[PDB]
Amino acid sequence: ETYSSYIYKVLKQTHPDTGISQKSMSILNSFVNDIFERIATEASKLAAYNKKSTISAREIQTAVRLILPGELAKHAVSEGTRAVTKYSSSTSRSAKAGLTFPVGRVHRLLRRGNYAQRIGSKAAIYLTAVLEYLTAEVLELAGNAARDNKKTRIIPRHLQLAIRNDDELNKLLG
């Protein structure tokens, strides 16, 4: 429900240049929740459809293809595939997967909302990488609208401008 600190971390990894206001963070935090709900729900119906007791990374991946607009989908799938692949060859979970967002908190969230009987680990890693990639994407576009306008602080107007002036962001967050 609160990815704030991790959102702020993500922002500084690419643009220490840029700050973000309270309103902007809560709005951006709500987008993370909405995207989580819609992905978990779709994976939930997919698990039931394929007679699965457990939501695995496979259900997460398919759910990502369906919910996300064209280009965002292929990049999210690539990132989710990267986080799970790195964590496997490496045998915290976030660190092993190379993620900044809390893999443990997401798994738990997935787990206490009863989308399935069980939530596999690789699936929680997959979803976490997707939430992080998307969050960075919004921050990048919300940040570009701020920096292009010669400002150094993301305000709510910039989020609206980023989502509006971008087609795929528009399909998803519109």
Other C-beta atoms within 10 Å of 30: how many?
12
How far apart (Å, rounded) are the C-alpha atoms in residues 125 and 19?
A: 27
Helix (DSSP H) and strand (DSSP E) numbers for the chain: 9, 4
Hey, what amino acid is at 174? G
Give the SS3 label for residue 163.
helix
Structure determined by: X-ray
Resolution, Å (one decimal): 2.4
118, two tokens: 């069980």
Q: Give the HSE-up count for residue 27: Cα atoms under 13 Å, Cβ half-sphere.
A: 17
Q: Which residue has the tokens 């989502």?
A: 163
- The partner residues of 119 in beta bridges, in order of sequence, read 55
Other C-beta atoms within 10 Å of 33: how many?
14
65, two tokens: 């293809």
- What are the sequence ranges of the domains in the chain? 1-174
Beta strands in the chain (DSSP E): 19-20, 54-55, 118-119, 153-154
Short-list 133, 34, 37, 118, CA closest to 81: 133
